[PDB]
Design a protein around this nucleic acid. Sequence first.
RNA 1: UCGGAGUACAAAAAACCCUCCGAGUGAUUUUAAUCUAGACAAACCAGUCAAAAUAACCAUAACAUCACUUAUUGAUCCAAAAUUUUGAUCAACGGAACAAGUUACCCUAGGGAUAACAGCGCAAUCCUGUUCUAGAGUUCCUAUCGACAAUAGGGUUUACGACCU
RNA 2: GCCUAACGAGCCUGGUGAUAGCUGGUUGUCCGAGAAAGAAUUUUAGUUCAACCUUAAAAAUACCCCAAAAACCCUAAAUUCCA
Lengths: 95, 52, 110, 100, 19, 354
Amino acid sequence: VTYFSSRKGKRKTVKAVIYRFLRLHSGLWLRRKAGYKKKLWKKTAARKRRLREFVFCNKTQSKLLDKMTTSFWKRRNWYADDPYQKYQDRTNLKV
Amino acid sequence: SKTILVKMMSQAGTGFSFNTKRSRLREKLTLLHYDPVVKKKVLFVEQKKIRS
Amino acid sequence: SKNLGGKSPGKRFGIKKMEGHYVHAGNILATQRHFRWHPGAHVGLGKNKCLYALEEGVVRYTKEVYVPNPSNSEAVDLVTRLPQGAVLYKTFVHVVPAKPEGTFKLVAML
Amino acid sequence: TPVKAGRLIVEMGGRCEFKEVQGFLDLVAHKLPFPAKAVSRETLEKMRKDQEERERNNQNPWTFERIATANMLGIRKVLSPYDLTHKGRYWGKFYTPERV
Amino acid sequence: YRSKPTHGIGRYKHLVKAQ
Amino acid sequence: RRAAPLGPMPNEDIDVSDLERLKKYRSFDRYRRRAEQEARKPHWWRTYREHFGEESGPKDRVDIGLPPPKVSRTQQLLERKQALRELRANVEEERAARLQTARIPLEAVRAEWERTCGPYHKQRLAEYCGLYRDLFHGATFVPRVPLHVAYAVGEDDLMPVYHGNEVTPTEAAQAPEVTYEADEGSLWTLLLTNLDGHLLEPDAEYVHWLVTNIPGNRVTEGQETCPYLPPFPARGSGFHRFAFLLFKQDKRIDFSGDTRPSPCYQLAQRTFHTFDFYKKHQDAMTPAGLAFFQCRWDDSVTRVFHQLLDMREPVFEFVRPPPYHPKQKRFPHRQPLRYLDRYRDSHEPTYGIY
RNA sequence: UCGGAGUACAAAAAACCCUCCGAGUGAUUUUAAUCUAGACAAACCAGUCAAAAUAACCAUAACAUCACUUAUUGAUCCAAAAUUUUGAUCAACGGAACAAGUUACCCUAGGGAUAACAGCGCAAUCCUGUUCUAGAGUUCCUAUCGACAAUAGGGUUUACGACCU
RNA sequence: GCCUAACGAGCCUGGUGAUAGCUGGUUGUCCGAGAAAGAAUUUUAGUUCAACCUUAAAAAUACCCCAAAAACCCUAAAUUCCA
Ligand SMILES: Nc1nc2c(ncn2[C@@H]2O[C@H](COP(=O)(O)O)[C@@H](O)[C@H]2O)c(=O)[nH]1
Ligand SMILES: [Mg+2]
Ligand SMILES: [Mg+2]
Ligand SMILES: [Mg+2]
Ligand SMILES: [Mg+2]
Ligand SMILES: [Mg+2]
Ligand SMILES: [Mg+2]
Ligand SMILES: [Mg+2]
Ligand SMILES: [Mg+2]
Ligand SMILES: [Mg+2]
Ligand SMILES: [Mg+2]
Ligand SMILES: [Mg+2]
Ligand SMILES: [Mg+2]
Ligand SMILES: [Mg+2]
Ligand SMILES: [Mg+2]
Ligand SMILES: [Mg+2]
Ligand SMILES: [Mg+2]
Ligand SMILES: [Mg+2]
Ligand SMILES: [Mg+2]
Ligand SMILES: [Mg+2]
Ligand SMILES: [Mg+2]
Ligand SMILES: [Mg+2]
Ligand SMILES: [Mg+2]
Ligand SMILES: [Mg+2]
Ligand SMILES: [Mg+2]
Ligand SMILES: [Mg+2]
Ligand SMILES: [Mg+2]
Ligand SMILES: [Mg+2]
Ligand SMILES: [Mg+2]
Ligand SMILES: [Mg+2]
Ligand SMILES: [Mg+2]
Ligand SMILES: [Mg+2]
Ligand SMILES: [Mg+2]
Ligand SMILES: [Mg+2]
Ligand SMILES: [Mg+2]
């Protein structure tokens, strides 16, 4: 990560994150499973399903990704037609 | 002996494919499989040879 | 060298829930390499031979008589060679179901 | 061949009195790797009855068994599990008969 | 289980000799 | 560390020494039998039966019965031996056997059954359906006198009430024909109770039809305490059970206490405890016959509540408990996306300040 | 790298240039679907089970089977395919897209975390004694010796260990 | 070998505050708690995850735990689990 850029002196984002993850606004990150397109003939249908999932990352990973990612990506987004707008608030969480 | 990975196609006119390990010295493979689009048990005949 | 590759991690085969515990439907009660515990009442058997609860309730272990399925050649042979008084026993896991199946409520008074 | 203390190595019978057999057997016994003795039926039962009689005669209240089993002074920390059976009579491969 | 009174209840192989 | 078995270990009996000289069951079936007999004994280790509710297990039965019919053992035995000699003698019968053509005159078997072991079967069916559990609470009686109840569905139609059978409330709109066999020095009391379907009181029941001081087999001649009220389960709840009880009484009994008004369409007025009612008259009345049926809501019942009881009609559902979800975690790890929906309140977007 | 047994005696886990067997797949037809409560396992990545509900089929018809069945396997990117997939003795098997020797001509940074000298530990090897006598000594065990073995010491040798430098 | 007293490739200046997972060093006082290693890794002189731990904050049960309970040949000290 570049903490202070050369031209702007701001903090850069690591684009390699932005291609494989998704940040809901609650702070949860969402990712594909690994190896889900790989060698499908060789796998059980059950395993294949487990692979086709979208899954959530643990706290540590989340904080790591947040550090690797600038402020812009944490903003509240309203997209038209967006699949994921349903999931961006958190509900009934007693902690 | 070696086996082979063949791409098998539906005769239901629905493009659907599934790959199978098949004996190299055996005949062209044909099976009764499940096609998800038509939601039926249909005949699949091997279209292509994928991996050797 | 002569000896090679003895190195593999444990499989954590064990018994996950113990007698008297509460369980929710779908909990794995045990996992095993060979049949050690057999599934009893309200306990489903997986294809890897692990036992899971089919009902919410309380786990109980029990010794009980073993009468194999006649489609199984091996077991019926083992049973068939026994002296005339003897009975195979095995260890089973059950879940004594907790909640009642359902209730009757008053929807509307017409 | 493994040999645990208290095992008969060689058994001689005959119309002999014990004394001749004892005389030349003690040589053999002496050239064995462990300490050993030449014994008759009479000798053996003699030393066993003596072994138990010594242990019901004992004047001091404190015996290895009594202390070890009840874990007095937390002594089980310094003892091995096997000790519970051996009762301080056996230590390693050694065996002291005088130990009650 | 070795500690229990019910140990070896399932014990059979001594009844049938197949070797 | 070994423990010591408490009492006998199961196979400890047979000799392992010399296995060849021991007889085996080479049949799967013999084994199955022996095993099922072993599964019925009272073992000293935790067992299936113990946890899964043998329902009080051993129970000393308070018996309020009619005394068992006294018949000579040896005489009966001789007579049956002879009858079977006769029946086995004929060549016609044997022909009917080898050629697989024979029939049993079911009416006559139903007759003999009703006469002989019927009472016991009816008893255990009643125990099964827990008649005794909701009526006398501890008590088992054997139905010595057979009770024949029927309903008129039309001119030619007759719907019988056997023990446990299903009947529709349409059929039961009218009082039934009741038949049993007694000469007359006799006095009886007949009772129809709805074992469940009381609305307010879980432990109590409804008397539908109660009749008393019944000479012999004469049904209508008895003074009716409670006028016939047709079966009325509620739409939601399934299968209420109605019970016909028959009591042999000695002295004429009069009760102004239990007597009900002639129309009697009030529910508070028919509320009943068979136990209590029996406790009262216990000295004279001994329960003799029994017949009962299963009944579920059908169309005609709607007319009852509105027309007779002057009520709205209560309707019920069958409600299953809401599914169990673990505590929601701040960072659900390696969990599918649809996770967030399990804790969802209702499906609707909500824009808080927006 | 993966698995089975012992080590690791009874929940789990558990090391070694530890002891032993294996795997890098065949054969077969029963061609083994979609979706989802709850769990196991777990640093992460990966792995495992699985009810209900759908759809397929007898017209209330979902565990592929066998070889100890357990293991028969490989991430991203990137390439080929066009609809949906396939691709590594990437075997150094959590995988650098592609790189070998040699230095006594050597250099720097360090290390007694690690060798060569010496010390120290230990005593396999080595050396001393005693114990035991079958035997050699023509006869005779112990004048002189003494096999098979026994008990104890010494701390020269070669090692072994890597504790000071 | 020799190329201005150091040539396996001169010297000087600049690149330059080269870069060192390696060594050394790191400056007032007093008080509160307080740590020995499972996993990967051209990795075992290092990192990054766990488990511990520290500072705040919300809670509710936490250890200790008697019966009962956990395998098939033999098998100990004992574990697991719980009022
Ligand atoms: N087999 C294989 N090679 C790959 C993959 N990704 C990148 N490559 C690399 O791509 C290059 C292809 O050129 P090649 O040497 O095969 O002609 C190789 O250096 C190979 O290592 C992959 O997924 N599989
Ligand atoms: Mg192992
Ligand atoms: Mg390991
Ligand atoms: Mg000696
Ligand atoms: Mg008789
Ligand atoms: Mg766990
Ligand atoms: Mg299903
Ligand atoms: Mg590597
Ligand atoms: Mg590696
Ligand atoms: Mg790994
Ligand atoms: Mg790289
Ligand atoms: Mg030279
Ligand atoms: Mg040279
Ligand atoms: Mg240097
Ligand atoms: Mg050193
Ligand atoms: Mg070190
Ligand atoms: Mg030197
Ligand atoms: Mg040297
Ligand atoms: Mg020196
Ligand atoms: Mg040295
Ligand atoms: Mg020195
Ligand atoms: Mg020494
Ligand atoms: Mg001589
Ligand atoms: Mg020296
Ligand atoms: Mg040494
Ligand atoms: Mg060391
Ligand atoms: Mg110069
Ligand atoms: Mg520096
Ligand atoms: Mg390093
Ligand atoms: Mg230093
Ligand atoms: Mg410390
Ligand atoms: Mg690498
Ligand atoms: Mg950490
Ligand atoms: Mg206990
Ligand atoms: Mg507790």
